[PDB]
Amino acid sequence: LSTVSGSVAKVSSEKLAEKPVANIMDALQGQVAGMQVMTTSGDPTAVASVEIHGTGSLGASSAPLYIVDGMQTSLDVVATMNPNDFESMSVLKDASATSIYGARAANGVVFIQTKKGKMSERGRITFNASYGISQILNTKPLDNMMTGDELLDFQVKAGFWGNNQTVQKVKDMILAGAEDLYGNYDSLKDEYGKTLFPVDFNHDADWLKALFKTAPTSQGDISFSGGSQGTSYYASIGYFDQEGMAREPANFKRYSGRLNFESRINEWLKVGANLSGAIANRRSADYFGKYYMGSGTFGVLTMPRYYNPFDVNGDLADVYYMYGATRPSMTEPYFAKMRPFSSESHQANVNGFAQITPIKGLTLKAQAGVDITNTRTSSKRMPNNPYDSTPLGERRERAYRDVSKSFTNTAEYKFSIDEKHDLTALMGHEYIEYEGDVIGASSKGFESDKLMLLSQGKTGNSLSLPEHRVAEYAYLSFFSRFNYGFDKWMYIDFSVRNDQSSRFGSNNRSAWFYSVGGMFDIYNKFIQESNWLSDLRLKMSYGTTGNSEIGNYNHQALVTVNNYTEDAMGLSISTAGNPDLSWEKQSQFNFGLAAGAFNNRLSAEVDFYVRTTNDMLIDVPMPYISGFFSQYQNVGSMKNTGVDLSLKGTIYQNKDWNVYASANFNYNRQEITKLFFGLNKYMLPNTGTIWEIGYPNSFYMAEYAGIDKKTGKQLWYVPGQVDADGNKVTTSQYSADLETRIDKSVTPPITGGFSLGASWKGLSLDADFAYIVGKWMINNDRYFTENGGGLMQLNKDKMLLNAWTEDNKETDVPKLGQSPQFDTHLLENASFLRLKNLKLTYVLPNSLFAGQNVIGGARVYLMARNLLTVTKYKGFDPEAGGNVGKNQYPNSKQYVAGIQLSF
Amino acid sequence: SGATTATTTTSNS
Amino acid sequence: DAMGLSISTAGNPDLSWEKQSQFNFGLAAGAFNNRLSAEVDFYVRTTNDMLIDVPMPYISGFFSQYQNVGSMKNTGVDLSLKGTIYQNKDWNVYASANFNYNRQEITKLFFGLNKYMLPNTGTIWEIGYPNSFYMAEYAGIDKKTGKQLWYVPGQVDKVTTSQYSADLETRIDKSVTPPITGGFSLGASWKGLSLDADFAYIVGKWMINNDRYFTENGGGLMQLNKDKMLLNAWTEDNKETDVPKLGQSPQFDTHLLENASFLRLKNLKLTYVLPNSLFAGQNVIGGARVYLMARNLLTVTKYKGFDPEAGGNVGKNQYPNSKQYVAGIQLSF
Amino acid sequence: MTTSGDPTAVASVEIHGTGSLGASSAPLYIVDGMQTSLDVVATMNPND
Amino acid sequence: CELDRDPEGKDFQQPYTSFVQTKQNRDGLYALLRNTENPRMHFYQELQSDMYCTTITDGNSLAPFVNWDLGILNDHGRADEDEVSGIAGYYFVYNRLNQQANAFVNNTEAALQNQVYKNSTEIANAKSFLAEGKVLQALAIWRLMDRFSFHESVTEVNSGAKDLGVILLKEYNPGYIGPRATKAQCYDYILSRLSEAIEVLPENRESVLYVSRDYAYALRARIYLALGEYGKAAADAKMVVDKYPLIGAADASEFENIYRSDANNPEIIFRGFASATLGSFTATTLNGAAPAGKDIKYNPSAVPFQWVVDLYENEDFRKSVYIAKVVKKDKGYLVNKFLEDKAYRDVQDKPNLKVGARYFSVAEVYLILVESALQTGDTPTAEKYLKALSKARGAEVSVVNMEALQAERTRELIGEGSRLRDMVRWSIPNNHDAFETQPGLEGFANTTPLKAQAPVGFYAYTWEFPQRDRQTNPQLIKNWPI
Amino acid sequence: CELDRDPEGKDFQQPYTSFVQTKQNRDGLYALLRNTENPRMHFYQELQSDMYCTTITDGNSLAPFVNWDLGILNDHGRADEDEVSGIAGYYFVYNRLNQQANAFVNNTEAALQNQVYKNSTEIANAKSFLAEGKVLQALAIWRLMDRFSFHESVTEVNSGAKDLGVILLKEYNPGYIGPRATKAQCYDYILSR
Numbered sequence A: 001l002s003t004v005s006g007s008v009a010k011v012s013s014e015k016l017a018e019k020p021v022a023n024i025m026d027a028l029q030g031q032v033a034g035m036q037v038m039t040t041s042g043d044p045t046a047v048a049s050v051e052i053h054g055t056g057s058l059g060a061s062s063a064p065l066y067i068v069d070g071m072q073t074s075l076d077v078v079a080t081m082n083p084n085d086f087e088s089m090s091v092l093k094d095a096s097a098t099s100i101y102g103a104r105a106a107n108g109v110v111f112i113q114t115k116k117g118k119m120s121e122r123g124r125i126t127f128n129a130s131y132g133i134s135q136i137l138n139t140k141p142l143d144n145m146m147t148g149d150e151l152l153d154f155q156v157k158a159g160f161w162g163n164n165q166t167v168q169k170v171k172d173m174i175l176a177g178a179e180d181l182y183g184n185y186d187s188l189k190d191e192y193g194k195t196l197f198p199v200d201f202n203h204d205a206d207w208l209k210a211l212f213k214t215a216p217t218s219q220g221d222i223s224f225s226g227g228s229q230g231t232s233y234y235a236s237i238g239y240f241d242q243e244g245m246a247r248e249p250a251n252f253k254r255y256s257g258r259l260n261f262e263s264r265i266n267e268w269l270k271v272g273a274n275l276s277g278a279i280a281n282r283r284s285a286d287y288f289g290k291y292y293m294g295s296g297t298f299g300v301l302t303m304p305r306y307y308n309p310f311d312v313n314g315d316l317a318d319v320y321y322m323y324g325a326t327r328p329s330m331t332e333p334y335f336a337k338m339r340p341f342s343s344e345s346h347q348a349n350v351n352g353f354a355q356i357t358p359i360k361g362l363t364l365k366a367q368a369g370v371d372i373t374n375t376r377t378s379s380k381r382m383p384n385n386p387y388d389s390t391p392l393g394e395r396r397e398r399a400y401r402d403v404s405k406s407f408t409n410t411a412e413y414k415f416s417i418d419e420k421h422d423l424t425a426l427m428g429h430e431y432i433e434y435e436g437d438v439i440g441a442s443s444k445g446f447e448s449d450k451l452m453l454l455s456q457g458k459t460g461n462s463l464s465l466p467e468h469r470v471a472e473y474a475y476l477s478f479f480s481r482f483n484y485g486f487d488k489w490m491y492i493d494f495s496v497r498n499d500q501s502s503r504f505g506s507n508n509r510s511a512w513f514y515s516v517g518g519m520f521d522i523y524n525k526f527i528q529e530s531n532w533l534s535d536l537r538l539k540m541s542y543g544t545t546g547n548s549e550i551g552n553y554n555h556q557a558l559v560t561v562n563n564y565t566e567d568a569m570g571l572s573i574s575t576a577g578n579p580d581l582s583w584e585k586q587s588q589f590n591f592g593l594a595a596g597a598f599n600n601r602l603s604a605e606v607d608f609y610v611r612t613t614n615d616m617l618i619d620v621p622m623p624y625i626s627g628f629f630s631q632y633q634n635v636g637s638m639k640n641t642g643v644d645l646s647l648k649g650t651i652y653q654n655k656d657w658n659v660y661a662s663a664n665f666n667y668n669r670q671e672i673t674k675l676f677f678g679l680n681k682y683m684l685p686n687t688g689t690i691w692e693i694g695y696p697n698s699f700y701m702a703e704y705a706g707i708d709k710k711t712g713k714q715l716w717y718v719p720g721q722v723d724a725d726g727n728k729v730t731t732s733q734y735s736a737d738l739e740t741r742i743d744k745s746v747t748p749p750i751t752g753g754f755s756l757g758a759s760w761k762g763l764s765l766d767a768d769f770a771y772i773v774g775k776w777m778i779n780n781d782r783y784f785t786e787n788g789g790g791l792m793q794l795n796k797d798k799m800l801l802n803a804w805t806e807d808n809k810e811t812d813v814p815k816l817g818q819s820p821q822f823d824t825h826l827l828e829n830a831s832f833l834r835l836k837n838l839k840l841t842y843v844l845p846n847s848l849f850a851g852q853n854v855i856g857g858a859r860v861y862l863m864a865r866n867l868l869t870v871t872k873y874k875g876f877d878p879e880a881g882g883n884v885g886k887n888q889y890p891n892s893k894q895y896v897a898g899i900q901l902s903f
Numbered sequence B: 001s002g003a004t005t006a007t008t009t010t011s012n013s
Numbered sequence C: 001d002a003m004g005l006s007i008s009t010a011g012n013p014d015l016s017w018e019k020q021s022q023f024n025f026g027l028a029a030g031a032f033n034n035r036l037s038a039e040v041d042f043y044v045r046t047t048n049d050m051l052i053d054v055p056m057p058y059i060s061g062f063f064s065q066y067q068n069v070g071s072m073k074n075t076g077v078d079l080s081l082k083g084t085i086y087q088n089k090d091w092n093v094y095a096s097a098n099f100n101y102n103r104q105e106i107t108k109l110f111f112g113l114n115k116y117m118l119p120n121t122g123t124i125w126e127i128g129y130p131n132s133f134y135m136a137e138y139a140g141i142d143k144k145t146g147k148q149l150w151y152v153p154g155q156v157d158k159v160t161t162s163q164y165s166a167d168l169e170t171r172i173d174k175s176v177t178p179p180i181t182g183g184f185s186l187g188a189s190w191k192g193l194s195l196d197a198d199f200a201y202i203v204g205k206w207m208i209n210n211d212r213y214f215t216e217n218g219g220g221l222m223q224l225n226k227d228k229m230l231l232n233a234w235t236e237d238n239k240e241t242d243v244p245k246l247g248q249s250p251q252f253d254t255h256l257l258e259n260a261s262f263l264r265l266k267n268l269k270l271t272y273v274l275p276n277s278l279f280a281g282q283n284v285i286g287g288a289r290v291y292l293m294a295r296n297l298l299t300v301t302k303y304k305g306f307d308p309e310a311g312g313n314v315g316k317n318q319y320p321n322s323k324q325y326v327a328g329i330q331l332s333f
Numbered sequence D: 001m002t003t004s005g006d007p008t009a010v011a012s013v014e015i016h017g018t019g020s021l022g023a024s025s026a027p028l029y030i031v032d033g034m035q036t037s038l039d040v041v042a043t044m045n046p047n048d
Numbered sequence E: 001c002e003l004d005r006d007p008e009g010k011d012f013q014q015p016y017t018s019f020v021q022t023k024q025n026r027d028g029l030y031a032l033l034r035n036t037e038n039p040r041m042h043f044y045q046e047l048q049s050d051m052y053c054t055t056i057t058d059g060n061s062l063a064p065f066v067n068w069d070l071g072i073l074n075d076h077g078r079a080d081e082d083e084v085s086g087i088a089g090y091y092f093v094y095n096r097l098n099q100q101a102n103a104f105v106n107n108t109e110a111a112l113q114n115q116v117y118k119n120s121t122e123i124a125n126a127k128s129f130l131a132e133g134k135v136l137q138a139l140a141i142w143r144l145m146d147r148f149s150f151h152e153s154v155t156e157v158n159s160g161a162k163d164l165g166v167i168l169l170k171e172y173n174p175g176y177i178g179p180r181a182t183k184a185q186c187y188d189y190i191l192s193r194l195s196e197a198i199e200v201l202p203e204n205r206e207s208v209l210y211v212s213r214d215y216a217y218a219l220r221a222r223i224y225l226a227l228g229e230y231g232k233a234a235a236d237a238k239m240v241v242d243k244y245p246l247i248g249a250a251d252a253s254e255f256e257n258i259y260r261s262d263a264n265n266p267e268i269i270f271r272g273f274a275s276a277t278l279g280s281f282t283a284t285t286l287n288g289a290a291p292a293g294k295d296i297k298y299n300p301s302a303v304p305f306q307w308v309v310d311l312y313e314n315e316d317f318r319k320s321v322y323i324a325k326v327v328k329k330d331k332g333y334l335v336n337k338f339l340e341d342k343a344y345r346d347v348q349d350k351p352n353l354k355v356g357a358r359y360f361s362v363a364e365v366y367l368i369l370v371e372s373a374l375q376t377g378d379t380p381t382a383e384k385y386l387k388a389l390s391k392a393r394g395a396e397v398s399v400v401n402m403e404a405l406q407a408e409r410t411r412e413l414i415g416e417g418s419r420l421r422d423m424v425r426w427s428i429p430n431n432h433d434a435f436e437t438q439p440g441l442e443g444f445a446n447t448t449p450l451k452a453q454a455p456v457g458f459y460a461y462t463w464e465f466p467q468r469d470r471q472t473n474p475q476l477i478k479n480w481p482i
Numbered sequence F: 001c002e003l004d005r006d007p008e009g010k011d012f013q014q015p016y017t018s019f020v021q022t023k024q025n026r027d028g029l030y031a032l033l034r035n036t037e038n039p040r041m042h043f044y045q046e047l048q049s050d051m052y053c054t055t056i057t058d059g060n061s062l063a064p065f066v067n068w069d070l071g072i073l074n075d076h077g078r079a080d081e082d083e084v085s086g087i088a089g090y091y092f093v094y095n096r097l098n099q100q101a102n103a104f105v106n107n108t109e110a111a112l113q114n115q116v117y118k119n120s121t122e123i124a125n126a127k128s129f130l131a132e133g134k135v136l137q138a139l140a141i142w143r144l145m146d147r148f149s150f151h152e153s154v155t156e157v158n159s160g161a162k163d164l165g166v167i168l169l170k171e172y173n174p175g176y177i178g179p180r181a182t183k184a185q186c187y188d189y190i191l192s193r
């Protein structure tokens, strides 16, 4: 798989099996040292974001290579694989281990191996089933917002409804002219006042119950595993279904299948296949991340509490009212009923290999595989809707297709040149290909919901133009790896590969990379027997790899169709191009020390790495006078220096108990060493960040001081100026020259986790914790709930009542008519410690299945995911982010109870 | 759906 | 502006599934040490409640309904026989043959009716007969004036007219589906070297040759290439021929019905298994095989239009079947 | 009877004559327990 | 293996070798112009004047511009692959138009010099295309100089930026960073493009959808008026004022039927192609309109003040077309100029509120001619055109004394964004806090004070350079002191 | 396990489930009535009166009616898809309107008693729609009884057809084989509608 002198961290099968999410990499948060998994949404179709040893490039991707059984796959394809089929997961975070993988294997390789059948006299049949519920994890930030009466009094006093206005006038003649709007609609005309109070000033509406819910989750699979003396098989069929916890519908559902087969034909041939397929339905909540009125967690925070979306029964209505509107506003279950959306995706991955040993020594292996996805999605806009802009409906149908091929042919010759000198030589070839297209058609003008085929629309100016998008790439690669081993204690590895991709120019596409690694077993040569120490290895590596993940056609200078009339066509300039685009080179030095202890009851690993990115691919911000947004270029450099250490233990007590533990840690220091246009710093506009030479990716904003107690203004520190003895100097006029680079990093430096595990006679308990330390985020929702300057129709925080006036002059929140800025008072400390899962399982004892020969085992477990969080972030979730916390879909909290019958 | 409330910071990283 | 809707096809909630009852009687026999083997089978296959779009009465408010009416009976006999003809220890000669004869008859139609003609098909469903062809018979030409002559349905003396009309068509006693189907086969194998030949025949099959509407046409479509028999057309000098004058347009009478019965050498293979003594001091390769094959090599037909089989009830601008020569290997290693 | 020398053409098969008027006369093609169509069997390697 | 993968639907940038390639890139230049000079980009400089009051519907979108929020207006707008809007979007679209017109002009100049055209009619058409590209370079540079450079009556600036223009590129290269030109260099470049392009384009208008000599005269008169030179402005406006008749209507519905239709409006010098399927867009910011079945319902984010409504007499034809009394179903007025055009409709019965781009109309040539004739001391011409324009619009002016001129120019160009430039050119301060709102709309339109006072000579009448510049080249001098 | 597979892209005849389906089926019923109650269908009983004289432009088309040619009038007219005209065309279009109105009225009554209409406005409108459908049923039956049933002042008839009407069908079925209802039942049906 990898080299002996490599830094490889293996994750077993008990960390992947019983997980209630479709995000498999979310199960690895706080499990590998140096690998930082962050998932920034609780959507059932969202996917994780992995960074091994810090971020590596400013413009290209930093994601690892994801490899299932030899073929490299995307993470949405691995989303459609049953994780009860996975045997192990090994993360090759080194330069001497990722030497035979070459697309973007500078970022690390995550290798997933599927189960094969352990052969015996009787095969094994297991049947897993599971059910659970999912909730929202933090309902604390809406315990500080105003009520209805306080909000109307605050709005009346703040002049929002006009000068000389009593709370009773705004309450009666202004807002309760919701009778005029509801009286124009036949379905709400005779329902207003009886069972429909859209404006309610006595009680307060619950918007968390209107916008979020408790969702179900279920899964189940049957799996057979067997094998004879030559062959072996593992088959599995399954089912997974997860509903989203918001009222805006999002779901993931899949029916999977897998057959792994492996056969020894005769004394020189061995063949095998890993066939897989699925039928999956996805749907994502595709309004989160932006600010609308009654949408998302922004809607549970900022909707005025005197607006009722319910009935008198307590059930959710079809519409609600907001003052000034010209039509009613649909709720979420009704907007999801008049805009349907179905997706159906068929997936098939077929791999296969043939392995030939003609003579003793060499082993010619050939491997080939194809991944095929055919997606077909449809959406509607249903006709005859009273609360719409038009009574006519629309329908749009799209058909996606992806096909990826790969071939890998190696030939390895392994021999022994003497008694105590081992050598191994490997050479190989690899060809990866991809092509994909989207075709799409639309139709508008339907009048009945049964006559809604796409060929039955209006046929005049209601016709439109189809959609079509094609993409493709290819990689060609050759490699060779040599190993040498001395007597048993000294190992050297050498490696040379050549990589070409289709994403670069015709005379810039090929590159040469190399790697040198070495391991020294100090225990088996120097101190061959000891009472407490049990193993001691020292490994050291230097390598060079490349990164090429930027996008397909980015070096050409192009021209597209921009039609003017309907007679002749027109041509506009698309891109600028870059004729000398090439690879991004990354060199990594690694030095590690692995040690064991008291008959391997304690073990530890310490690794130090330096990682250097030269000629990095930056999507550089071309200035606006060129007429292009950006351009991919080979300019800049970066460096990541760090240490990561791991340790496993066993602390157990008696004959029956078995108590163990583990821990991880990783500190990582980034540094930008060269930017693009001869610049020393570049401030990214409207992000709040900066790239400056010598420092990591930091934050960049003014420092909020407080308020002036005599005038009520907001005050900021003028940077780099101190007056007489006193304090620093402040100012009350906001300028852009007040912005200082803060010593607070965008990507979090400290990352880790730990674990506890205890057991007894059958009963077992497991607990995994994962922490991120050093994270900061700009809370964007506190721009909307904490200002008196603008957006006065929204619900505000309770502190704005105690505002500065000439009467009330010993406060600390500012005067009313002032807009807030994106300064240091919006940077929140988003570091967290999370209890990832808490599992309590009970293997049923072997005494019950004594005489019955059809059932051979049973196992029952309870499980709770995401049930503890230790934060200072006041924003529904610290993990959902990446420098700005927008209207976010928070992480779920699951309670799952399943069974397994091994009969 | 609805009206969009402005003054967001554009997310990068 | 607004959509309206109205019923258009009328359905019926009593749609059945075209019922069928079949009675069968068979006899199988095996002669000397199971060498000669014979099998004979007689069948009566009755179909009721067939699916027709029948023309409805005027109280329906529609023109047709798609209901289950009708009946049909297929009566037949099929037999097959195998044999082995040794003359030696190494030699193996064998033979096989089939035969099937099938007679179709319509029993009853829809609304008391005795005879129905599907529009724009050219066939006719008459009670007591199979579904036949529906065309005007063609007598020949009249060598006093050189004009075409068609028979009159009825009017026996028959009587011929020189003026074509649509009231001149009649039922032709030639069925659409061919009645006799078969096929036989030989085979011989000396030692490894085998030779197989398969033949397949269909007799009783009639077919409208639509390209002869164009390639032998006296009047009209004059820019095309014609047949050589238009060079001795009827003039007043040459008046002892049977091809008409050059000013007339042909019809779709029964001078376009061709007899498309054939007999096709469907397959002819020459196999040679390589002998076992050649793979002696080896354990990699187990055996081998070579073959030479010819498909659609020979055809015996009285048709005039590139293929009797390619078609089916009418022969338009057609794709003829292929004649193939194949060589093949097999390495059973 | 196959009515075309086209490489993408499938045959027309009738067992014991044409049964119906105005319906299909093709048999029921089963491949390994479940039913198929002749265009689907055209994609299966017949050496299996 | 060949690993060459080339895009679909995209070709390579090549020099022009045919005449149909020149025609194709010219049609691409005009379709790029249609998405730059459309009324959606001139709403920001219209709301920033003293005529608008934000309602309670506002979600902080128009409220920076109306209430003068200089903490947002410094770094405002986006220009990326998601959205193009704001001050940064206004900067980006005119720099893109300037660069693409540069590429077209230099490529067709080199094709003319290499003799790749066959006949003489192709040479004549290629020279006309070259002049039509020179006009568009002039328009792009002038509209950037309009917003991002100081008028000469300014008091406090960033030190060194009172006599600076914008960054002036005269040939196509996207890899250029440099310092700002002066105002004299940019104005001689603009006027050289226009005077070189008038001498080539023919005398009569070929088509209403392409650049003519009439549009070059109209643009040069507009630039000369906004410069401060009235003799040349009157001399240029006199050559185009008598070729385009005004709308002859008898009541407000006839004026609505002829004004709103682009195809039958008889006083358009230049406009962009629009169909129901290609070239139409909705501009529903100033009126907030939304279709509902067969009628329209309005929810405006900003409504005009009472002094704006009181400019129009009750029998004016523009008091039911340009502003309409449709707020709260009958209670108040909004700016309803860019409502709709009934030709660009999916179904003819149901509105979809789609309009097209118009670049110049003759009712601004009249106002340029009256203002220049009044300032150069010519009284019969100013009356001869002001009585004609105001009588064709419905209610005639009695006396012509440059108060009637200010009122008529404010009445005629509402929604087009010419009031901020006028109140800079006329030394008019803001006085947004002093104005009263419409009395029928209380509860909906209320009193918000300015977040920054804007006297005569304030720096914030001209916009600040977007913050991708000032970051990618540090030899760019910014505008504002803060 | 339900195994109903309804055709996507078209509707079929069934009891209603919404008010928009009822309104759309009513508009289709009126568009059907427009081609039935035409002036072009009533010209054959105008020409059979004593106030017309055929000219030399005739081609024996308007001639069997003005001259009372009782051999052509015994089976006159055609109602296939090419042309709907004559006495058979009259009979066809009025039995077609009667069957479509029967379908609309029975579906609206089943939808009214099955309580599928939401507010009171749709219930009131659907009751008025039902009344319009009943008027169209009475018009169809009267316009058939006018031409195909004997007046009381007739001398010589077929034996038994003196007091018979037209085939009074009250439900929707296109395949119907029944007898002629008596004249009293047909007139009571029309007047009760």
Ligand SMILES: CCCCCCCCOCCOCCOCCOCCO
Pocket (backbone or CB within 6 Å): A235, A236, A237, A257, A258, A259, A273, A275, A276, A277, A348, A349, A350, A352
């Ligand atoms: C020598 C390898 C030949 C493999 C070709 C077969 C390809 C067909 O597979 C298509 C993908 O479908 C996946 C099958 O799903 C697995 C179902 O098996 C589980 C039942 O036990």
